[PDB]
């Protein structure tokens, strides 16, 4: 019934020293029924990464939409969109459906190509921006992710340390949520290289 | 209501009852539940209302316009789909309809299409629609063969309506028979259930439960 918790899933993003990390589980379900273990919730438009939790048809629709918009942005601007600008675009796009919204919990992550500054942001379904320094959480296990991140996180982590933190935050949160899990992916993002790691986790 | 229609060697038999009720009150015993769309097409009326009357006489207007433009008899497939596409536009509004569009053309042969106010459109060999459909289905299924004679097929349809008219409280009055051939439908009379019941009981030896 509740659109945001039919399909389930989670996304978490963190900042580190000269790097950001974004991670998601792979589950798509129809309430109790597990349907797919390959439903990735993180997408990217150039060097800007977008995680999207919530209703899966909208996750897909919004990805396709932001691809559409960032492609036209690039053709006209003659440059790739930045995380700060994209965040505003996401907020704009969500609020234009103020009285008929996409049931989603987007999360932006990326490094500004010019300043080199790590950036993360989160939104509610209606477009309100949550720009946190430390971390952003989203999905059916957001309470669990808040609890994990709040205790596990410490500022200025190196990329390979940040990976361990965000991975353990996601995994242990998803294991306390019936509608999350079935695999997980973690992106480690630096100014000019990105490493994508699939995690081994319990498949129930 | 009880309406049936079935394909066989000799074409199509259409049989209907005649009762119309508003709650427990019997409003009419002389209702025509077979629409004569045109001389080659028939439609049944189950569903509760004017909806079948209104929209199937309208269907006759569309079939006439078709053969004026195309200089060719409309197919049973096309005719039934004109109706199903129409009621599908009205889906949700509250139309109440359950009909068999029956016809016999060159390219198709004898054809029956069940059309529904939910938008359902099914081709088939035997259909039964109404509050007394289950009773009619019992007699049909146990006695149906493709190689029935026009005489026996007509009787089977009549007897199947009678079976429903007896048990189903909201069916009865009288039985209307039709026989659809390639050269058009042929009316086979109005049969009062009251008289038909005793006639059938005696001649057939059935309804031994009932005292006559």
């Amino acid at each position: 019934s509740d659109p945001s918790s039919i399909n389930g899933g989670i996304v978490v993003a963190m900042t580190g020293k000269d790097c950001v990390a974004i991670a998601c589980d792979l589950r798509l379900g129809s309430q109790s029924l597990g349907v797919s273990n390959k439903f990735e919730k993180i997408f990217h438009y150039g060097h800007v990464f977008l995680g999207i939790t919530g209703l899966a048809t909208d996750v897909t629709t919004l990805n396709e939409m932001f691809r559409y918009k960032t492609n036209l942005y690039k053709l006209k601007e003659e440059r790739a969109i930045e995380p700060e600008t994209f965040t505003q675009l996401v907020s704009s796009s969500l609020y234009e459906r103020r009285f008929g919204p996409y049931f989603v919990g987007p999360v932006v992550a990326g490094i500004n190509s010019k300043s080199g500054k790590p950036f993360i942001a989160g939104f509610d379904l209606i477009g309100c921006i949550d720009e946190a320094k430390d971390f952003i959480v989203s999905g059916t296990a957001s309470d669990q992710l808040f609890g994990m991140c709040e205790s596990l996180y410490e500022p200025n982590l190196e990329p390979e340390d940040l990976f361990e933190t965000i991975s353990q935050a996601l995994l242990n949160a998803a294991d306390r949520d019936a509608l999350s899990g079935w695999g997980a992916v973690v992106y480690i993002i630096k100014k000019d290289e990105v490493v994508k790691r699939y995690l081994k986790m319990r498949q129930d | 209501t009880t309406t049936l229609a079935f394909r066989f060697q000799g074409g199509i038999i259409v049989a209907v009852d005649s009762r119309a009720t508003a709650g427990n009150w019997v409003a009419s015993q002389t209702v025509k539940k077979v629409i004569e769309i045109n001389p080659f097409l028939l439609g049944t009326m189950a569903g509760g209302t004017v909806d079948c009357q209104f929209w199937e006489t309208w269907l006759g207007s569309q079939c006439r316009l078709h053969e004026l433009r195309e200089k060719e008899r409309i197919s049973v497939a096309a005719a039934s789909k004109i109706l199903s596409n129409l009621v599908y536009q009205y889906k949700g509004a509250g139309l109440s309809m359950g009909t068999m569009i029956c016809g016999y053309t060159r390219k198709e042969g004898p054809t029956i299409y069940y059309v529904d106010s939910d938008g359902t459109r099914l081709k088939g060999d035997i259909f039964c629609v109404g509050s007394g459909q289950t009773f009619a289905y019992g007699v049909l299924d146990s006695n149906y063969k493709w190689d029935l004679s026009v005489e026996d097929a007509l009787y089977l349809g009549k007897r199947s309506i009678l079976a429903a008219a007896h048990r189903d409280a909201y069916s009865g009055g009288s039985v209307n028979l039709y026989h659809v051939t390639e050269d058009g439908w042929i009316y086979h009379g109005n049969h009062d259930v009251g008289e038909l019941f005793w006639k059938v009981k005696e001649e057939e030896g059935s309804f031994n439960n009932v005292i006559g």
Partner: protein, 244 residues
């Protein structure tokens, strides 16, 4: 009433021609020459900017060669402003198709769409046609490398090598003479620049009076790269081919 002042843009002449289309084509004949040449391993787009100034900021300037998506580019001949209206429409169609089918739009489908828009302005609406001719250079996995052209009438055709704008008669003869089917991109680059060098109304062909682009499979493995040449890069290729 208003009828008195109506030019009636969408009518036939007694001969069966569309006045405005014919006059729009006359307009395009005064525009800078644009050339497209299709090779086996890529496409070349070469185009001449019209009598420029020394104070014109060339590196940020774009009047001839535009990008529709990652696979398809166009060369413009005519009113730049009119072209940009159509270009934005084309860019949107490519994205709509991508959103719908989750596949990059085939070149011909995009070309047909734009050409159909142009056609509409010649048949209805009472507005003047777009005074623009395009050369479409593109690639898809069905037909591979493709060259097209469309004009204000809305008619489009396919080409191995083609010119639009000024001196197309002279340009098309020179291309027809030196073009071959087994030709390569580096050879086509040379032909394109040699053709413009001979057909130009200027005294000499220099880097500041040119826009240049190549669509190559010369991208790392099975994929396609668009290269819009920079002023310094156009200057280099002019020396390499031995024109300056």
């Amino acid at each position: 009433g208003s009828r008195r002042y109506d030019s009636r843009t969408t009518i036939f002449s007694p001969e069966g021609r569309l006045y405005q289309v014919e006059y729009a084509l006359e307009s395009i004949s005064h525009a800078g020459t644009a050339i497209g040449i299709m090779a086996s391993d890529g496409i070349v787009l070469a185009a001449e900017r019209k009598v420029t100034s020394t104070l014109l900021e060339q590196d940020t300037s774009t009047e001839k060669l535009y990008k529709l998506n990652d696979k398809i580019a166009v060369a413009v001949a005519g009113l730049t402003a009119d072209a940009e209206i159509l270009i934005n429409t084309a860019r949107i169609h490519a994205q709509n198709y991508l959103k719908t089918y989750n596949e990059d739009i085939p070149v011909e489908i995009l070309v047909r769409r734009l050409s159909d828009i142009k056609q509409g302005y010649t048949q209805h609406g009472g507005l003047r046609p777009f005074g623009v001719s395009f050369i479409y250079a593109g690639y898809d996995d069905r037909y591979g490398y493709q060259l097209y052209t469309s004009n204000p009438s809305g008619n489009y055709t396919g080409w191995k090598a083609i010119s639009v704008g000024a001196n197309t008669s002279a340009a098309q003869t020179l291309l027809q003479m030196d073009y071959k089917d087994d030709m390569k991109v580096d050879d086509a680059i040379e032909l394109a620049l040699k053709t413009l060098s001979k057909t130009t109304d200027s005294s000499a062909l220099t880097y500041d009076r040119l826009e240049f682009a190549t669509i190559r499979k010369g991208a790392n493995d099975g994929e396609v790269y668009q290269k819009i040449f920079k002023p310094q890069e156009i200057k280099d290729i002019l020396v390499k081919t031995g024109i300056t």
